[PDB]
Curated annotation (Swiss-Prot), chains B, C, D, E, F:
The active site is at 48 (proton acceptor), 121 (proton donor), 154 (nucleophile). GO terms for biological process: putrescine biosynthetic process from arginine. CDD domains: aliphatic_amidase (cd07565). Is an aliphatic amidase with a restricted substrate specificity, as it only hydrolyzes formamide. Probably involved in the nitrogen metabolism of H.pylori. This is Formamidase. The gene is amiF. It comes from Helicobacter pylori (strain ATCC 700392 / 26695) (Campylobacter pylori). The keyword Ion transport does not apply.
């Protein structure tokens, strides 16, 4: 298969554009050095907010935002090409529509300097996050060692429906870049394992440790944790075998859950019952997902973190 | 809240109707004794296949099948009334449509002796199981201590969308009665935790132990295992449940409120959040056109490996 | 040091005197067989209720109550002499005072067939147990391999003050014989460790497994679990105990010598330490005036919830 | 309930008063930032020695000692008032008696800027610590979300009687601020759990991390660990605490109500229970005559191994 | 790869040849039933003493001994050919040299009903076991899914040199059949992992549970435990083995390729590596002069503790 | 016994000899401070590469190499003599033969500043390491508290034969100093446990933490982990070692005395056992012809992947 490296990167305090640039060059130095230390490494993963940090007073301002693609994404692209590796990076992207808030964006770059995947955080961690819900869906790209790669961002990994989507579109190695799984420590480990098992795919996940807030995890396609980090600069590495995930989905019967979902009870009814019989699926597809207890909920907007509840662009 | 008890019941080898009757009387005696031992208990849970066992050569036959409701369910209901507890039972149910295979059914009986919940296994554990896919959806009923109870069956608990459905309909205590989802022992503990966390609800799960194949588990609404049984028959897994705390988490929490975020993405940047999830499989599954890219090359798409016909209809009689 | 064996005994259903004698013969059989398989073993421990079971309808009756010493204890003593081992046994003891309820009693017998220790359960597990609180304090006796043995019974192990008392009187090997204290499974493991650590002594604990309940446990004098049994009947928990090293720790340690510190607080600043601990409950409990600020608002202060009368005196005979 | 936050604070090297003021402002800074990061936090806890460090060569000198209250405590008071939180702070406090060594002191300040609890370490960690044994008992104050707060300091937590004392005076949230949980780390985890379980109360404990000796732990009233920090500086251990659940447990429970059982032995057979625990050490300690049998042969009974005089009085100027 | 099954078989008390025959039929019954339940299984493994039990008073007598091959082994072979699986069995083999004690033997029979591997326990568990040290070395045969099977017996697994020898002869799936890994439970788990890691091969190991012991264990070639059974009789430990990945690791690994490094020390500084390991015990053991410096003062060097004669030859007849 | 201290030393980025000089002074300061912190400590252990780092582009140059003995070793001897401790240090040693690559060396210095053990890395971690295979075998020296000390270096601890050799020469405390326990994390923990259990000796092992790449581990002679550090720089793993108890187990044990069994197989059946192990690899390795059957198809057999020449001699000067 292929060797993967997940880096428990310490993002510093970011005060200006000068600091963002230091992060970028620190990320590039670490990318080249990881490759130097592990010549066999083909996939190197950096966490969410590793480029621009988490300055909640500044992160919405023009100085703290970037374009994808831009001159900084091309610096990473140049770095991946020179090192001959796949690289995963995090960039808070300026929305081309100026009446809308910026995006939380992840990108994947191949060993030739080509951006082969772009994803915008579909589920921002609210009420703390002011990012606009993504519009690129859950994309999948071709990676090393026969892997089909997809990336989600921190809070995204808590939604099992999203993990299903990546797998539904071919993904067998599910990448989760993460900024803060703080106080949500147990559940970060839990969901990484469940996202793997539910869909018969690998999960490679890493949280920012900057400087002591993160962890790093690689799970087998059966949900077994293979590698686990504890510290800033911890490099979580592991050997991935995408073909084994592909083989399980093709040759498994008893625990082929991803297949059973759309082909319920196929032994009694040839082909299986296609209608899952779930009202929430039908409501969400139509776009009227409503929980019975919504009217009595206390936090339905980001007012508690000093954000306006009017909408549009703010913090520019 | 309330006190729950889950029984790692030993079902024996079932060779006839006499064994089934013995199993019913065994389950009844266990119910009264569990109430006698734990006076505060309000919910007693027996695992899948506890009534009828797993005689794979006879379990599709008419002698091994029961009606819901019938004289067997009335004995369980009589017991629930006399012991003053909520009961959860398993019954392989004779399909009213004679052209179709029987159902794998779970029922909940209240302290009055009434079936307040009936559920047919939506996802049979194929290729080994010949049961017909359930047609009653995922129902939710009122339980003790302000709980909303929903029951799934063994293999059902491996599907996270089903745990979402129960919660979507109000469930704060998700019950998983389980037959023999063995060798998937790691993933049984895993999914019970994830089913709880994803939906901010309790999970109370139990498997058959008999003759040494069981496990028993109660999980908190944050996904933390509160109580855990080993692999011994007759092991009673009990614990105190606080359904209001699960409800309060759903109402008060912001950062970890994942069940809300699914249908209301980014409610800080966009007012009320984006209602469209942007997921192709959701739209495909709703229309019934759910298809995986690798379906053509799959090896197991029927139950011929275990001797069952591939043609469909009623068989095994 | 010496080798110990803690037996996760299965006491069957006890319905008559005939079943008690069968238990007695089973225990004697096991003790002889344990020595046969483990030639170097010097201490063999049986759990609470192993002699008489837990028939809560009959356990206060004359048929179910024995004398200490009596013809039954002499049989245990005979076996201990024949096998040349130390034996720890459980007996529900008839109260010499017929106006008081029977005691929950444990004994230790030496390889000479003599009762060297007799303990009556100081803290009966209420409100479920009708046993009279013991009057013999917390005794300590000489044992094998340089040990000073003391025994507590199930619920007694939840009381840290009791573990301190045994240790205060010289005990370096703390035995906990446990009946049915189930559901409190995590806290059984926790307290065995903490009882050991607080006092710098070994703990050797065993619970009844019969049909599947108990988990034998051997802890080092620093609170570390050395041997842990599962939940199966007939599991024999064995380990090599070195009592001299517990003594050595008590003599040589400075930083973690907590048992000394309690009576000599801050001895560096004040030579010999402050002897007054500064705790009100200690002085209250000593004068028998220990009272919690919330005692008037408590709901369970009698055994009526299990059916026992609140009047006092002898009942259930 | 209420949200708590315990900082695995790094104390740097402290060589002068200059460094002490540096730490004070660092703590104030951390207090404000934690409230900003966690909007609903009501209780913020800092470890032992966070203000003054552990410069054992200098920590007894007048430059390294403060008064309670003083201008340093006032800076903390102001910070808590501005942040609207309860703060827990460490101060090595100059002794009012000039012939006695300084006290190792913990203080709790409320959101109104008032010190509502002042505790002096009752059991200094001998022979390494030269602090005078505290003279203000084990105090309890009113806290947020209906909590009754009490604080003990590192080594104190190894004494179960001190945990008993706090609970006896109403405490339902037991705070442990610590400056040594290295190589005693396993036992630090163990005792935080046992202190909680024994007394049916929460424990919130945090050890100094700087810079790598740290720890952070929240335990539920049944002794289960809810949150666990690793060994890094600046790790903030946070969780939601429900003191009313601990209160409910103390009132509702029968079987596991060990704190009540201590004073009312076997209340079923003897109504109201036996008030005399029947423990010699309780009576000895109350009278100031607590004496271990092996005390005369103990190696360490003074602080000479760390270079402290054995004569007492005021030293280390 | 292939699917393996390890049966935690319960051996009963064995008192005669009639009981041995019962055990043979039970094993055959289990083999057909396991193949029926797991249609894909290609290797079924039974533990040490499953045929004959551990009647120490009788296990050396002619009645309790069998021939390999004999009519009993051909009954096992008949089962393997009918069920179409590889089977691993335990037989206490009568020594063809009647002046020597019987062997403790393990055999592997292929799906064509033929013995393809025969092994005699090289390291009997002394002083409890009276079996003659095996003379057949450590053989390796071809198994299912491209595996190279080798078998060792319980105590054998505690010797790392033996695990090396099997791998040195091609083994990538190391089978360990076990009678008692009791009170050696922790070290059984430990060495099953280490035998795997040291040699870059799978280990599949199962112990008797008969009545409660066996801990079925499948380890990955990097030493990680993949499947783990508890202590119950009849537990079937199953998992998929991929023997070719163990082969690939041996051919492709540089850094952690320890099996190669042993005979090729520092090949970067010295091409081909230094072939002499520089170990005196390796040279001593090859020459049969392995001697520990403390052997003169050792207590147990014969079997007198378990009643065995110390002068050798045939005994127990 | 004695108190050991294993420092999870942070290796800095070493660019010059000045940086090497900083490391030496850092280590000396650490050594003095650890003795001051723990007055009872007798053994202070520093990891591999602590003196010189891992500058793979410069670590073969003469500037980055030292002599044993040398002025740098005498500075450690100075420190050890002043502190009155046993010290363990790592030095990349200039090869006295100019045509050979330098050695990876470890030394033990007694309380009188004398080198009492010199060991050269027998198994350099290939392909990454260019160090020459050690020519001093596995030496054993007298240590504190009755200990026989032996030292191995990182990758050495992966070879069970080497751990056997040390014990074969009297070692009861096996020290492992390591550079990277990274991506080898689990296997480092496993082998430290197995090295202990296989040979009935203690293992004290520590890895470089600096910037976050290590752990520290003390295992009992039965393979049980007693103390475990995390991944932080400057963590000091300490514990009490009792070498006499490892000796006692070797003298007193029968059943689990595996180190004796290796040279005396089946000694009950055949007095004194069969001295011939019956293992081909032992005889091949003693003869210098260790040859695995797959060696011809192996990929990595040199250090070209890390840029090292494939013809030998002295390179990187």
């Amino acid at each position: 298969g292929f060797l993967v490296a997940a880096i428990q990167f310490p993002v510093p305090i970011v005060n200006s554009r000068k600091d963002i640039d230091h992060n970028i060059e620190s990320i590039i130095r670490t990318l080249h050095a990881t490759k130097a230390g592990y010549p066999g490494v083909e996939l190197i993963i950096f966490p969410e907010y590793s480029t621009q940090g988490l300055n909640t007073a500044k992160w919405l301002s023009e100085e703290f935002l970037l374009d994808v693609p831009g001159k900084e994404t091309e610096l990473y692209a140049k770095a991946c090409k020179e090192a001959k590796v796949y690289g995963v990076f995090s960039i808070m992207e300026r929305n081309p529509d100026s009446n809308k808030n910026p995006y939380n964006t992840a990108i994947i770059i191949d060993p030739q300097g080509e951006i082969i995947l772009k994803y915008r955080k579909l589920f921002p961690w609210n009420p703390i996050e002011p990012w606009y819900p993504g519009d690129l869906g859950m994309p999948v790209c071709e990676g090393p060692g026969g892997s089909k790669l997809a990336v989600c961002i921190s809070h995204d990994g808590m939604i099992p429906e999203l993990a299903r989507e990546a797998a539904y579109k071919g993904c067998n190695v599910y990448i989760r870049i993460s900024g803060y799984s703080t106080q949500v420590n147990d559940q970060w480990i839990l969901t990484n394992r469940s996202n793997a098992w539910h869909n018969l795919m690998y999960t490679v996940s890493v949280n920012l440790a900057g400087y002591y807030f993160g962890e790093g995890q690689i799970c087998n396609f059966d949900g077994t944790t293979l590698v686990q980090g504890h510290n800033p600069w911890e490099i979580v590495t592991g050997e991935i075998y995408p073909k084994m995930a592909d083989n399980a989905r093709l040759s498994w019967g008893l625990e082929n859950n991803i297949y059973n979902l759309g082909h319920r009870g196929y032994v009694a009814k040839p082909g299986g019952e296609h209608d899952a019989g779930l009202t929430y699926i039908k409501d969400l597809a139509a776009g009227k997902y409503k929980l019975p207890w919504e009217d009595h909920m206390k936090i339905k907007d980001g007012s508690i973190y000093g954000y306006p509840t009017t909408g549009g662009r703010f913090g520019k």
